[PDB]
Amino acid sequence: DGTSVIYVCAVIILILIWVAIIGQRQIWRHRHNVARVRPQVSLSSRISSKKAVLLRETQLDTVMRLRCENQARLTDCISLQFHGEKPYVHRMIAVDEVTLEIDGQLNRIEGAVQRQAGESTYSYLKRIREKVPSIPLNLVHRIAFLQESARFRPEKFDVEQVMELRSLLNQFLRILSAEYD
Amino acid sequence: SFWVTASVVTLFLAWSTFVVLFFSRVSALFFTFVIDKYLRLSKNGIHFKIGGISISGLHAGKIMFRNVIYDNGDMTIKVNDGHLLFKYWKSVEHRHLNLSTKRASRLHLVLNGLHVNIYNNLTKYTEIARIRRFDWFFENTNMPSSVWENMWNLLGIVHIEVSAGCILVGNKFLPYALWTRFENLNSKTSVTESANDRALLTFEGETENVAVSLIKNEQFDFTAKDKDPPRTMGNDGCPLLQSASLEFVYKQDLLGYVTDDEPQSITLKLPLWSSEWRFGNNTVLSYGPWAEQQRFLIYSFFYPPDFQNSTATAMPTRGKKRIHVKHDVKIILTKETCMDIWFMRGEQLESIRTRCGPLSSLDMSILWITTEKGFYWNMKAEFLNFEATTSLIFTKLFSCKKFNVDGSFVYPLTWNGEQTWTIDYAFTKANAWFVWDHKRLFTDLINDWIGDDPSDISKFVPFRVHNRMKVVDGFEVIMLLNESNWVDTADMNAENVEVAIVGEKLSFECELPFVDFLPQTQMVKYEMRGEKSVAMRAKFPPDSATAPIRAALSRLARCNSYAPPSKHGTHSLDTDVWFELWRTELVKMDFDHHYRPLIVKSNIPSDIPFSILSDYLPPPANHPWDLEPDYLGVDILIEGSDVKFTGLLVKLLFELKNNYFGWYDSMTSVDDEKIDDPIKLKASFDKTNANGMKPVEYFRTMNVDVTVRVCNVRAEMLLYSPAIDEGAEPEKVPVVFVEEVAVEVKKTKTQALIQVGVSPACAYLDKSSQGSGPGCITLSGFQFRGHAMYSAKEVAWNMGLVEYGWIMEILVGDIAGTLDFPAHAHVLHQIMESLLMFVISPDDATKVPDRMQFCQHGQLIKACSIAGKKTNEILGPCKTEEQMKYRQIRISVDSVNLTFVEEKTILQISADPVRVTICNAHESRFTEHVCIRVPGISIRQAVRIKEKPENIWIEGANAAIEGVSLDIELPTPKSASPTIGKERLEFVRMHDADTKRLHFLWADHSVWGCACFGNTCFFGDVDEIGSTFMETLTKKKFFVPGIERNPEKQPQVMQSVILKNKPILSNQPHMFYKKPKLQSMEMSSSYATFVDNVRVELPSAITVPQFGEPGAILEWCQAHQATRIINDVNTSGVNEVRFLAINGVAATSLDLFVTPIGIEAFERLVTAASHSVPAINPCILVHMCYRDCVLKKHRQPLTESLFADEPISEVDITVDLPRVSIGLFQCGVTANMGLLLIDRAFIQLNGSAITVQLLQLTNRDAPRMNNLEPRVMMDFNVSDTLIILERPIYEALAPVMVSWLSVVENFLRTVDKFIHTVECWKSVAMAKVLKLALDSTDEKVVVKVGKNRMGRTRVLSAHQASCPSCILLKTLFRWFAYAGNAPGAINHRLDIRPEFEIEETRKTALMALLSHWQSDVGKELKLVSYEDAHRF
Ligand SMILES: CCCCCCCC/C=C/CCCCCCCC(=O)OC[C@H](COP(=O)(O)OCCN)OC(=O)CCCCCCC/C=C/CCCCCCCC
């Protein structure tokens, strides 16, 4: 009877196929131990869809842009109730003075805007001076140095430096408003 | 046909395999499509996908699944496979959920291969964008009680099982990701009854493995700024908290609603929210500064600062849902746990590896709300059996039986507000090892931890740290005080000289007020107290040639201590090896540190071009001396003390200064210092001193004002106390009582002012067995002043300082003493012997490490670059500052009145102000000079005649030497170049032009000056005291305390240089330890009628001084003054009738009066000397023999190989001899006196008139008291004398000769008897000790102890290893120290046999004992070379 031979051949080949597939799957499962194999930080290593990976990469880029743009405003109404008398209040005033006097004033249609990445007072003032060459090169350098000395440098920063920075900012704004009526 | 059945079977195979192994994929596709559509996941930006699921097992509650992925924009949750069982066959116990009863686990979840990857925190960043109106960011991202109760009743216990799981924290913008992994997580989530809340959710479970680490992000663009981790475990990255098991219990109240009228309380009915973590075996728990930087980066990303001033949270009111108040964390270490701190110093991996015992817990309460004070979080760590070790060559750091930390950290509302850290440290029975390398290591660790990021005002947050360290139940600090800071790194039997400070309570407080942004100066104050039963113990290597001597001295000294021994310490309780020499009840040390913070100005993020940036910035300093120095105020007080004084105290103080505040701050193992090429020697030295890698402000100097005050010091002058006589009280160790010792050091940039002030000091000497009485010595005061002059010319910045002038001034007050003879003379002799032996320590002296042999230029003795410039070489040998500096010592002793009292004789030695000066650049000569100025010293003697109820004393003899003014010019030191004088002159005038403090170099005088005179700057521009120092004509005491109120004029004697217009000594009450509970009457009368009678007034009653109130030591000194010998005018007698290069006057005059009774009294003294000889300890004899060996440098005939050195010329003397006036007298029943007068002589060699006259007290009857007795002369004269050697009457004269010659013969016989007595005693006692040591089986008494690994580093190591007569003596020291029969020599013992009187037998006994000892000695005897000539 050939039917019995066909049946037994089918049974043995089916069992062999099943055991081979399940053994390969079991080997794969055993090898992929998540407590032994070091993972990858890449999002594409866990998410197969390219659209979701791209969306999350864009969200991470937006978060990094926010981190760059997230700058503390030291000169604040309730932050001056604190400090106020402490010796470092003057540099706190100075670091925000440049921002308030320039960005808060030059936030118009034709005014320049500080870049979100690589935010530099020196580079921003250079960009402004490129459009408006009336401002001397000494003015921008001195203003940038005053703000940088307030922010980072151990040299004595006091009311005199704050007054100098305010006078230079007033001169800069006066010339820039003369050039921008 | 076969084709049809083949097609059918192929279809069977395909369909069956697909439906049994691949239908899950299509079912998962369908369910993935359905789920995100029905709940709108894709619309809400959620990526969801299922790679496999089963539908046929629903009627068994089983739902298999595979490749389940869930991403919501913040974290990715991925599961490789698993199954979800709902065991519906388990009956529901109740209609409604009863939280108070047990429920079956109807829900069972198994997850295989769980991934959780947290890469973003969109909520906080969206909140920040909303609060800052960043509209651009907000658009680019493109973004029920009944049911709860029924579901929790239906599910019962949620059994969640995770075979393997990993948690990854990080994204593409973080350099490193936090990888947390575990295995075999079995957990049971349950809901139970909760007080004040809806329900309590508990998440218990265990994990059979857990590990956390920081792994490298592959997407990151690492630059040179990024720093690699100190250590990695292969691909796992930097480890953190490895463990073998973890048991976790997470509890969280499910919040309800407020029912009371008042809002939710902050302290009452708090919702429960806790977390418990119990760790098993193999917990390693590493960390470090690099891990801290990575933690800061990851946390700052995932928890960004909004820079918003917070507000006190509004507590929910009635009817509103409650909120969580705080979270409690409890971490328990159930086994022994390691806790390591790893950091990098250059290219070497350093570590602080600690350990804690089982059941060491960490508690952590974190407030989850904000109040009007902001928010805070607590911490309570407890480490049992906490043991710490370092990575240095000396790895021992710390150990205690319990360590408790209580930290409270408060954050105010404003993000910029001042934080407050309050940390309390508590130790129980803690012992520590302190080396200066530990301070260097911890400073490097702290600097690495802080980092190199620049300070930003927009990121600056002020904060104070309140540190309070407490040690209870005993503390112990061990300091390694090996000479030249050698260390033995052997784990066992470390042969290190160690000093341990022990006590009951130790305190340490330190506030860190970092409340200013880049302040010009930062001030930090430290306090440290040892508060009860404080002691100082000293240990020496067992075979160091100091330990046996010290142990013998301690065993044999008969000292009574007022301070009970301290039971504290852990490694210093072995009294046989540890010597407890100091005992006090309080030691407080205060530190006041003012410093300019070291800002790395190269890290300032300046976008301005450097060309114009330098214009605005101030010019940088070219030299470290151009900077304003830092400040450090040190204030140490020792409240009281009971001291076992010895020279080892001085030695240990010197080693402390060298190893902790001197050039030798760095340890050196005794196994590494093997370098012979100076080129590579300099290279290794250069690498450690990386001057080019540091800014100029790193080498900023520091002004230090040290004030050390030691109060109420009772010191035991340890010696070999004599033998005990049965009928007499044992003679104890002499005791010195000092009320206060004040030490002030004022070190500035260019000079240091060392000033030591001592109050009046007593010395009570115990009454001897002879019976004369107790002795006393009184010192009115002592002051030391040292002016060190500094310069930085041609000095390496690592040293940054060379000393070219060193002026010292010793001022000794009035010395008054009343000592008995010969006991107290012997006491002084052996006190000086032990003191000098221990201070010098010739066999204990060690070679300086080659890398530590600094020069005048800050480089090494060998391979010095500046000397290389001379003779045009790369490197040459410079010379040390000791050989080149100008040193000058001024010594002044206001007075000296010592009386030696015998039964029938006293001998008073009185002196005038004595000045001694040592000047190595005296006048124009730059060689060692000694100047002696003794205006007068007299010796008087009184002989007691007791034929009356009142004592009768006569001036038997007199002496007087006046006008001694000698200038000694010692030759140049041997092995010194011929041009040392020129080199020293150039060195001195090079490092002086900037200051001109040594005025004698710039004076325009033909004859230069010295600090011998006032031609130097000494504590001021004008040296007032030094101007008239050598002017002894006025005879004016120099120790007169006073206050000088001119800041430019130098301060007077006993006037603090730290304070202003204040004496260095303050009379303040302090703690002290109380006491625990001739032979013929006719001849003597005949001499009394002629010789001047005197009254002797001894001190009234020498008692034991007690400190009591301030000034009581002064009162004891004032009561026991010097003995007075008062002359009587009515009994005045015949004592007065009379008629290399060395320069100066030997003496102005030399008086001498002698009578036969005076020589009789000298005989009395000599006889008393010999009587006390058998009562002397043989140990002092062993000590003196050993002193001979060591002072000879062990120059045996066997050790002559080591001595191959290979004044000798130009010795000239020009001195003036005194006018000698000798007056003799002799009376016998009648009075004959002979007067000798030698006029002044001079040596170039001449003489002068000599008059010898023999008078005769013959009355005015035969051709004011004795008005009838003139003097009739028999004269004899010599006109002059020049020696040039350059390289009846009988009847009256007979009684004179037969008396003077008889007395002289008796004196000479007595002297010979004393000499032979001493020799016989020496031989007999040495033989006795040798025999007793030979017949001893005690383990400690042995020829050689240990391996003597430290002996290789000692000078004269080869010599002492081949003084076999000195190794044997060291064994004898060990016999005195440890043998049980050693107290067999504390008996007053004469010769055991009458045979020992004969010389030959007593010498042969000693020779035979030496022969017996030779075989035992020779086993370890290391012979230098070989002497076969002596062997035969
Ligand atoms: C290193 C090995 C890892 C071991 C992990 C140790 C413990 C870590 C775990 C903590 C598990 C978190 C418990 C579940 C969250 C608490 C439930 C919750 O609060 O949901 C909100 C809501 C209301 O609660 P409130 O407290 O009032 O809300 C305040 C703010 N939410 O809760 C509910 O209404 C439903 C209550 C049940 C929901 C909880 C889910 C039940 C099962 C949880 C098991 C978690 C499995 C994860 C373990 C896998 C291994 C990592």
Ligand SMILES: CCCCCCCC/C=C\CCCCCCCC(=O)OC[C@H](COP(=O)(O)OCCN)OC(=O)CCCCCCC/C=C/CCCCCCCC
């Ligand atoms: C009070 C109870 C008994 C105490 C028991 C321990 C005895 C320890 C004894 C003597 C040493 C104590 C002095 C400790 C600080 C030394 C002061 C000092 O030199 O600081 C200088 C240093 C820089 O010097 P250098 O690096 O060498 O370079 C300068 C030019 N070459 O400047 C500073 O940092 C200021 C130092 C701050 C003072 C605070 C130190 C507090 C003392 C700590 C001692 C540690 C022992 C405590 C362990 C006990 C545990 C059971």
Ligand SMILES: CCCCCCCC/C=C\CCCCCCCC(=O)OC[C@H](COP(=O)(O)OCCN)OC(=O)CCCCCCC/C=C\CCCCCCCC
């Ligand atoms: C019961 C135990 C305590 C009893 C023991 C009493 C000891 C006997 C008495 C007094 C000790 C002698 C006082 C020594 C004072 C130290 C003076 C000193 O060395 O200052 C110099 C030095 C300045 O030179 P540099 O810093 O290297 O150069 C900087 C250039 N930019 O000053 C310093 O460095 C810091 C000063 C710290 C000194 C504090 C330690 C004082 C020493 C001992 C006091 C306590 C003794 C207990 C330990 C005894 C162990 C032998």
Ligand SMILES: CCCCCCCCCCCCCCCC
């Ligand atoms: C170096 C001479 C030491 C002995 C001189 C000082 C001791 C004075 C007292 C005399 C009695 C001691 C007898 C000899 C003891 C070694």
